[PDB]
Every structure is written in structure tokens, then in C-alpha cells.
Design a protein around this ligand. Sequence first.
Ligand SMILES: NC(=O)c1ccc[n+]([C@@H]2O[C@H](COP(=O)([O-])OP(=O)(O)OC[C@H]3O[C@@H](n4cnc5c(N)ncnc54)[C@H](OP(=O)(O)O)[C@@H]3O)[C@@H](O)[C@H]2O)c1
Lengths: 262, 263
Amino acid sequence: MLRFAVLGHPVAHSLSPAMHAFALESLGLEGSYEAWDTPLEALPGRLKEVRRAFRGVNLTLPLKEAALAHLDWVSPEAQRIGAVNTVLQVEGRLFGFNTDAPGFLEALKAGGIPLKGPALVLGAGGAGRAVAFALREAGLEVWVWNRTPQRALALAEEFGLRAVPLEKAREARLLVNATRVGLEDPSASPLPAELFPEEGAAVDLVYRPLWTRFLREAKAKGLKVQTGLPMLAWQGALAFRLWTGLLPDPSGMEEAARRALG
Amino acid sequence: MLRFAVLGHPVAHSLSPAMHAFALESLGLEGSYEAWDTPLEALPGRLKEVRRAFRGVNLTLPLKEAALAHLDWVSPEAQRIGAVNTVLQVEGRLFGFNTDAPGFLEALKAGGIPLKGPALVLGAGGAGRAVAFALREAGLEVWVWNRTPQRALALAEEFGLRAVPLEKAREARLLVNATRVGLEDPSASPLPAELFPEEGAAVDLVYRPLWTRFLREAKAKGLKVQTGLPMLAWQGALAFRLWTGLLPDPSGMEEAARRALGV
Ligand SMILES: NC(=O)c1ccc[n+]([C@@H]2O[C@H](COP(=O)([O-])OP(=O)(O)OC[C@H]3O[C@@H](n4cnc5c(N)ncnc54)[C@H](OP(=O)(O)O)[C@@H]3O)[C@@H](O)[C@H]2O)c1
């Protein structure tokens, strides 16, 4: 019993299998969590397959947004965010949820990052929307920026936030990189060093490398920093509870993910 | 800790607490399944407490119908049957399902009884509906009877069945008692021995007593028979799987009920 898996392309190096293997073991449960490559056009087929033999699955790039028109139910939050990262299967019916939003908040709390705004979310893409949704719910004043202005402006209107220029980063107290800038690229950062504030906190959703240029610039400025692992771990832990009713240890899953990275 | 419960009025004799206690223990899980007396007045206040402190709950009379309107999502089957016996709580949201229909079918399969029709369901009430529904989806011909002809003909239309006179029971190959006849009445049966099928099988949903006059008659005639416990055990095991993803041993679920019954 308990067949799980992460669907997306690519997923060859996902850290979920390692995290969830630990979750199952730690809770004394038998089961498996496997990495299963799935293009955005091979999705319809896989949701059918999930229905017949998986208790649940995580969705990742680039399936998160397209999965909605494919589930029997989608949570109010997942719908607002417009993306599902966790699917539960019961009686062949599929229910979509988003554990990225609540996971991010739990990660901040657990990591001792104060919820102090204004919070600037860099990136109005999928991850940016989930983070902006979470920070709005937490009641902070939220600003959003995007390389392409329209997307930031549209999101600001949609969520009742404020689209701002990169320069306003100096006035933010919580900075979140929700862009792909820096992914596998130690030379790139979404924010020029000179625009970082001198007090506050910075979080990077990118965890490859672990200490991105963005986090190094932030740490250099004396800001409290958090890597992308805590969020990854919490969204996974919350997903596991959705599936079984049990909450595996988040710190344990994070460590497991770290060990899995090398 | 996993928190479960059976909601209804009454529930003091429900065998669910005993069955799920076995499920939890046998599956090495920590948690509890309690019986919570819940009159219809209190469904609202009760469900809210569910969204907050329970992973899932079973619903028994008289809350199986008035629950649908209060849930965030109701399964199709449960929609068509018009009753929910299993509620799942996730992120404060409540989802309703009916494990009786599939539990009934899985009990027959696991017990040997072939889904060879034509099958006749005696009783067009709540119990009969769930069973009538499950049997056609299974792929066999299904007739329905009821002491009040109307309640039967209407069901034949709503579910695409066929209302028949009691005499038809003889031409059926699958007999199902969905009436309260025989409940704590060893000498009472809804079907006269003379109207019993020629070949086939019979299943009684009444499990108190376990061997009802209906089942004893059916057996004397040469029909294969099944008590009401296998269905009880499977709807419970399926409910547990629904809440956790793990299926407790249905045979063990039945044993637990048997012991709780003391027979
Ligand atoms: N740690 C976790 O658990 C976690 C959870 C979710 C996401 N993430 C990570 O965060 C990132 C975002 O993922 P996602 O699902 O939101 O998907 P995504 O859709 O692939 O990201 C599109 C977004 O990234 C920005 N971006 C891309 N290239 C850029 C460049 N060269 N310069 C400036 N901005 C650029 C986009 O700007 P435009 O709109 O202008 O293209 C936009 O805001 C990924 O690296 C992902 O691994 C991590």
C-alpha cells in the first residue's frame, strides 16, 4: 500500500523520493515514492494511471498549472494560486491541493525568519504566485516584481498587491527569490547587490546550488537567510499528511533531502 | 494521532469502534475510533468539530442524508444514492463518500457469491438503494421489491431498475434482504420459503441475529448464503483505506465485529 510519486519534466534529480522514503520509514509505514518523468502533454494519461494505482502524487514543472482542468476537485487556495502541487486519489477521484503556500509559511516560522514586511517577492510566475498568496494570507504588505512588468502588474491587481521596481528592494524587509535565476548558476542573481536592504531577511526557493549568489549577497549584507530546503521539506511533509493523515518530521525530511543532494 | 468516529443516533451498539480498533492496531497505527451520539439537530455543530479535529468519520442514521448539503464535495455514487456513510477531512475541507455500495460488492466477491443475476433487492429504503445501485454498475440485471409498491417502481425509474412482485423472487439468482424484517426476530422473514429461488444465492444485511430466518430458509433450499458481516467489514476497511490509504484485513474486521457481537 501507499504508492506515491512526483510527476514532472524534468524530475531526474528530484529530492522528494529521498524525503518521502524517510517519511515512510520514520512513520513505520510500507510504501514507495518514485520519480516518474511526465511531459505536459502526457499528463491526461498519467492522471488516469494515478487514479488506478497511486494514493497520491506531487506535481512539478510544468504540470502544476495544467492539472486543474483534470481533477474532480481543486481547493480554494490551489484555484486562486492557479497551481496544484499535491494530488490525492480516493475511489479513483482526484483532488488537487497546494502545499507550497502553507509549506513556505511553516518553513519561515520553523526557520526563525520573522514575518516582517514589506515583503518583496521576485518573480510573478508559478512559485511567485504561491509565495505571494501565502504572504498575503499572513497579512503582510506584499510587493511583487517580475522581469516582464505585465505579469507583476497583473498579479498585483489580481491579488490586491503592489507591483514595484527592483529598486524598492531596499525598502523591503523580507526578500524572496521565486524566479529561476541562479538555478545551477552561481554567477547569476535576480537582484543586483547594491539594491539589497541592510536589515531584514532573504529566502531563496532555488536550492541548486544551495548557497546561491542571491543568498550569498543577502548574507553579506547581514540579512538572516534561509535556503530552499526548508520550504521543499514542509510542502512535502504537508503533502504526506494530506495523503495519510500523518505528519512526518519536517526537519528529518529536510536532512534527508540534503543527504540526497550530496 | 489519527482521530476517527462514528456519528449517529444511536451508536451505542455500532460495531465500528471494535473493527477500526483492530484496523489501527493491526496496521501499527496510533489513534482512536469512538462512537459519538449525534442527533440530527447536531450534525452542523458536529461536522464543524470534524473539519477541525478528525481525519474522518463514518455516518449512520439519521445523518446519512442531511450530510450532503453540508459537505464541500460529495462523490457521484453518494450523490445518486443520496447518502454518505464516510466523510474525509483534509485541510479543513470535508468530502463525502459511500463505502456501502462498493463494500457490498467486495464482500460478495470475497465470499464466493457470483454476481450472476438476475438479482432481486427486497426493500427500496436507504439500505436497498445502496445495494440496488452497486449491483447494476457491477453488470447484472436487477429487480426491486418493496412492501409499498410505489417506493419500488420509483426506484426502478430513478436508478433504471425493474419493480417486481414478491413472486418474482423465484426467478432470481441473487437475493438480497434490505428490509428490517428479521432484525431481532429469529422467526420472521420477508420472503416465504415457497417463493425462494430455484438456484442461486441470498445475502441478508441484517446481522442481529447473525443467522436470520431468511438465511436459514435460503440455505435449506440449497442457495449459497452470506451474512451481513462481510459487507459491514468491507465498507469499514474501505473507509479506513479512504482515510489513510491503508486497507485493514477485511477478514480481521469481521472477526472483531463477531467478537463484539459475542456470537
Ligand atoms: N524550494 C521549493 O520548494 C520551491 C517551490 C517552488 C518553486 N521553487 C523554485 O523557484 C523557481 C520558480 O519555479 P516556478 O514553478 O515558479 O516556475 P517558472 O515558471 O519556471 O519561473 C517563471 C518565472 O521565473 C522568472 N525568470 C526566469 N528567467 C529569468 C531571467 N533570466 N531573469 C529574470 N527573471 C527570470 C520569470 O520571469 P518572466 O515572467 O519575465 O519570464 C518568472 O517570474 C525555480 O527555480 C524552482 O525550482 C522552489
